Swiss-Prot record:
May form part of a transmembrane redox complex through which electrons are transferred to the cytoplasm for reduction of sulfate. GO terms for cellular component: periplasmic space. Arranged into two tetraheme clusters and the extra heme 4 is located asymmetrically between the two regions. Heme 9 binds at residues 264, 284, 287-288. This is Nine-heme cytochrome c. GO terms for molecular function: electron transfer activity; heme binding; metal ion binding.
């Protein structure tokens, strides 16, 4: 009913609104964001990582929709989503919501294998992971949020209602995907690659099964399939790599590797990203035995 209190004295969960000084009477905006401060302060040790000026104050006090001098005119949009934040010579380097989450996927071995070969779509479901407010908020409450006159008890009630109705999407079972796949499209100098498809997916999922960040953004049941089966609709039976990646040079599609290179770059890309000890990329027979 009431969320767990924070040690910091920040609200446990917080509705964040599109704060600006230009009137916005029709509520032309994204859904507000309910930020779970409790979860974040328990995992991120230093308050100042986020509150980069040292002030434990709402970001929008300086970073408004239009920008303003207190935030060096860096807007709300930039503060919350920036991904190319320069390192600061002196003092703190700010983080945004998106940049820290990205750092998680690059710097953590259990994430960095898949995320070395994923190009995130960042579609509406990605936005909605944060832009996630309860349907109960009214347009009048939105206006007050924007204008800064929403009562703190109203903000917390909206935040708690939102948090308590949140549900994590369960990833499909690896049992609904092939056990092994005999990858023989190109077989010539080597035997087919007997790819341990289910072993792979099962191992990758086990290492992230309780991770709250992953759970939130991996938000379609078949989404982890797209790690490898990219650029096609989510499906239990996606098209073969070689439907899109030709065996030979395809000058009409210079961004697409040919099929051998497609396998190598994807399989080896993940192996390198999560520091897989065997097979090394220089080992030419562990993924496929030499042909007689
Ligand atoms: C969490 C990691 C976020 C993701 C993913 C996206 N947004 Fe976001 N956005 C976030 C916050 C914390 C805020 C501030 C609170 C608010 O709702 O204003 C924002 C703000 C915006 C804005 C500016 C305000 C507005 O005009 O409503 C825009 C235009 C915006 N966000 C757009 C947007 C889109 C289109 C996204 C998916 C491509 C998206 N955001 C993702 C946090 C997060
Ligand atoms: C990033 C992962 C954060 C960490 C770590 C901490 N805080 Fe935080 N805090 C963060 C956000 C995105 C927000 C919401 C701002 C909004 O627009 O509503 C907050 C909010 C607070 C507040 C409320 C401030 C206000 O509304 O004026 C306080 C008092 C606060 N945070 C304190 C605080 C402390 C002491 C922390 C370390 C123990 C801490 N925060 C960590 C993001 C993050
Ligand atoms: C005024 C007291 C601020 C508050 C509160 C927050 N930020 Fe801020 N931020 C402020 C300034 C003056 C600057 C420029 C600092 C510099 O060294 O240049 C910034 C910058 C950022 C950035 C970097 C943008 C970029 O480099 O393109 C981000 C991502 C950012 N701020 C985020 C941010 C968040 C998430 C805040 C609440 C947790 C927040 N800032 C508060 C001023 C102030
Ligand atoms: C690193 C300095 C972070 C910043 C800045 C923000 N987030 Fe984050 N987030 C971070 C971690 C390490 C985690 C997982 C915590 C755990 O217990 O494992 C998360 C998680 C989320 C989630 C999912 C859980 C939840 O709160 O519902 C979301 C939707 C999320 N983060 C949103 C979010 C927003 C809106 C932020 C900017 C206002 C933001 N995060 C900053 C690390 C960091
Ligand atoms: C392969 C089995 C994965 C593992 C292990 C992890 N992630 Fe993942 N992630 C994967 C896919 C296929 C996608 C979809 C990309 C898209 O947007 O279409 C994602 C998405 C995310 C996101 C959202 C995209 C982004 O902001 O970069 C986040 C924040 C995310 N994943 C986090 C995350 C973390 C923290 C992980 C380790 C605990 C992790 N993922 C593992 C595939 C896979
Ligand atoms: C990379 C780590 C993968 C993940 C995650 C998933 N699959 Fe996969 N799958 C992968 C490869 C390299 C291949 C070979 C494709 C080729 O054209 O050579 C496959 C194959 C399949 C197939 C076809 C099997 C066949 O007999 O031809 C299916 C039906 C399939 N994959 C389904 C699938 C699903 C549903 C996934 C998520 C649960 C999934 N795969 C993940 C690589 C990877
Ligand atoms: C068409 C529906 C595709 C299927 C099926 C697969 N891939 Fe793909 N891939 C496709 C495009 C359009 C592109 C080019 C993207 C660009 O930057 O222009 C790619 C690219 C790759 C790459 C290069 C790195 C990357 O951008 O991801 C690799 C390593 C790759 N594709 C491998 C690959 C494999 C092994 C597939 C079967 C599991 C596969 N692709 C399917 C389009 C399509
Ligand atoms: C991450 C998204 C991966 C992709 C893409 C591929 N592999 Fe992989 N592989 C991965 C890990 C993390 C490991 C270590 C074992 C574990 O799960 O902890 C492996 C290991 C292998 C091995 C060794 C033994 C085995 O488990 O089968 C082989 C021969 C192997 N991988 C082959 C392989 C091929 C042929 C791939 C593309 C079709 C491929 N891997 C992709 C992680 C990932
Ligand atoms: C797994 C991580 C691999 C490693 C390491 C290497 N190769 Fe590979 N290669 C892999 C796959 C999944 C495939 C497709 C197999 C098929 O028959 O469709 C391939 C394919 C080739 C091919 C073309 C097929 C053939 O001639 O049999 C060649 C010539 C090839 N690979 C060469 C090669 C060499 C020399 C490697 C060590 C540097 C090497 N591969 C590593 C997966 C993997």
């Amino acid at each position: 009913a009431a969320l767990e209190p924070t040690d910091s004295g920040a609200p446990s969960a917080i509705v964040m609104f599109p704060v600006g000084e230009k009137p916005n009477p029709k509520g032309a905006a994204m859904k507000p964001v309910v930020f779970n401060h409790l979860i974040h302060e328990k995992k991120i040790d230093n308050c100042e990582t986020c509150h980069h000026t040292g002030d434990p104050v709402s970001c929008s006090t300086c970073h408004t929709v239009e920008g303003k001098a207190e935030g060096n005119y860096i807007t709300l949009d930039r503060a919350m989503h920036a991904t190319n934040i320069a390192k600061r010579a002196k003092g703190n380097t700010p983080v945004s919501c998106v940049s820290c989450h990205e750092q998680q996927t690059k710097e953590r071995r259990e994430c960095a294998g898949c995320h070395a070969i994923v190009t995130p779509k960042r579609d509406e479901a990605w936005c909605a992971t944060c832009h996630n407010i309860t349907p109960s908020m009214t347009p009048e409450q939105m206006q007050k949020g924007i204008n800064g006159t929403l009562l703190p008890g109203d903000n917390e009630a909206l935040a708690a209602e939102t948090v308590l109705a949140q549900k994590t999407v369960e990833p499909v079972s690896p049992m609904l995907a092939p056990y092994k796949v005999v990858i023989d499209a190109l077989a010539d100098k080597y035997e087919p690659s007997n790819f341990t498809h289910r072993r792979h997916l099962t191992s990758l999922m086990e290492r992230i099964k309780d991770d709250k960040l992953a759970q939130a953004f991996h938000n379609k049941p078949e989404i982890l399939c797209a790690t490898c089966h990219h650029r096609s609709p989510l499906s239990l039976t996606p098209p073969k790599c070689g439907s899109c990646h030709t065996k030979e040079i395809d000058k009409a599609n210079p961004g697409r590797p040919n099929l051998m290179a497609a396998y190598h770059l994807q399989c080896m890309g993940c192996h390198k990203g999560m520091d897989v000890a065997r097979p090394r990329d220089t080992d030419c027979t562990t993924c496929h035995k030499a042909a007689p």
